């Protein structure tokens, strides 16, 4: 809280946080984790299993994905370059259901999204090439992993790009949010 | 375990972790942290309630840090740029007190370091500029923060520096280790 920002995304468990920066760019430090300052935010308890770290080219778009069977809370952010991070509520009897929220997630901006077990996730590559970090609170399991397609009519989520995103198969692939199957 | 190596270091309690990749430069996933794989590694559950993110210039010298109270375990790694990472055995009794090892970490070799509860860590940059990742399991106390300087005669580690490195007035007036205060 003195380490970071935490706002509320107009889907209100999805949280936006922002790390204060001690220093600036010829040398700084910050917080970019405080479980005082998380569980605060979320209000409750959180263990996260796995770390991931990946890196992409301009363009590609990796989502939406979730898993129903070890639901995945996610905690992202790019440490290299910039990318447009989103959320998908995927949750039975949510008022938000199947509503998205959308934010630029940058090394120099250091912002992160929380997106909690229940929802989807994807992000598109804005820079010439982005790394992307995330904490996770269950482990990936390839077998239970499912897709909505990036470009659902129904979502109509705002991709801030002007060129076709680059798309894995199983990703090009993905359901319609009509027949995708949800979070009990 | 399939997601990385797990290497004991000359003081064993000390593990170099390398974490498998999958894909390339044009493209690249890995774990950089899997509770499983580590605790097997290191043999006990741990939380990690802190996560820090710092950015240095070369020659920048940090250390060599611990605290006494709220001892903390650090799981360290470099994702811009290259440095070498010290850890110094400062625990009672221990048949390897007094001793060092070191590593070099980069973001291209992707090697991390577990330094656990009881040991100094420093670090020095190598390349222009580095960003240093590690995730701790206590909060960093100002308050308790105690210092051995980076090139005490007894330590005699083996920094490989060609310049004289940059340090903050406080890691410049670090005590010797011979008056340092250490682990019960």
């Given at each position: 809280?003195?380490?970071?920002?935490?706002?509320?995304?107009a889907?209100?468990?999805?949280?936006?946080?922002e790390?204060?920066?001690?220093?600036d760019?010829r040398?700084?430090?910050?917080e970019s984790?405080?479980?005082?300052?998380?569980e605060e935010?979320?209000?409750?308890p959180?263990?996260?299993?796995?770390?991931?770290?990946?890196?992409?080219?301009?363009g590609?778009?990796?989502?939406?994905?979730?898993?129903?069977?070890?639901?995945?809370?996610?905690?992202?952010r790019?440490?290299?370059?910039?990318?447009?991070?989103?959320?998908?509520?995927?949750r039975?009897?949510?008022?938000?259901f199947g509503?998205?929220?959308?934010?630029?997630?940058?090394?120099?901006?250091?912002?992160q999204?929380?997106?909690?077990?229940?929802?989807?996730h994807?992000?598109?590559?804005?820079?010439?090439?982005?790394?992307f970090?995330?904490?996770?609170?269950?482990?990936?399991?390839?077998?239970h992993e499912?897709?909505?397609?990036?470009?659902?009519?129904?979502?109509?989520?705002?991709?801030?790009?002007?060129?076709?995103?680059?798309?894995?198969?199983?990703?090009?692939?993905?359901?319609?949010f009509?027949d995708?199957?949800?979070?009990?």
């Amino acid at each position: 809280s003195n380490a970071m920002k935490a706002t509320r995304l107009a889907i209100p468990d999805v949280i936006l946080f922002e790390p204060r920066v001690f220093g600036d760019d010829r040398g700084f430090f910050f917080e970019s984790y405080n479980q005082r300052a998380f569980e605060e935010a979320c209000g409750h308890p959180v263990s996260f299993v796995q770390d991931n770290h990946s890196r992409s080219a301009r363009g590609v778009l990796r989502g939406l994905h979730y898993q129903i069977r070890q639901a995945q809370g996610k905690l992202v952010r790019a440490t290299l370059g910039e990318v447009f991070d989103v959320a998908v509520d995927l949750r039975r009897g949510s008022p938000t259901f199947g509503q998205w929220v959308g934010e630029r997630l940058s090394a120099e901006n250091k912002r992160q999204m929380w997106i909690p077990a229940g929802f989807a996730h994807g992000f598109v590559v804005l820079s010439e090439y982005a790394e992307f970090l995330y904490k996770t609170t269950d482990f990936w399991a390839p077998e239970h992993e499912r897709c909505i397609v990036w470009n659902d009519p129904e979502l109509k989520i705002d991709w801030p790009l002007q060129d076709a995103p680059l798309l894995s198969e199983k990703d090009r692939q993905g359901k319609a949010f009509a027949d995708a199957d949800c979070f009990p």
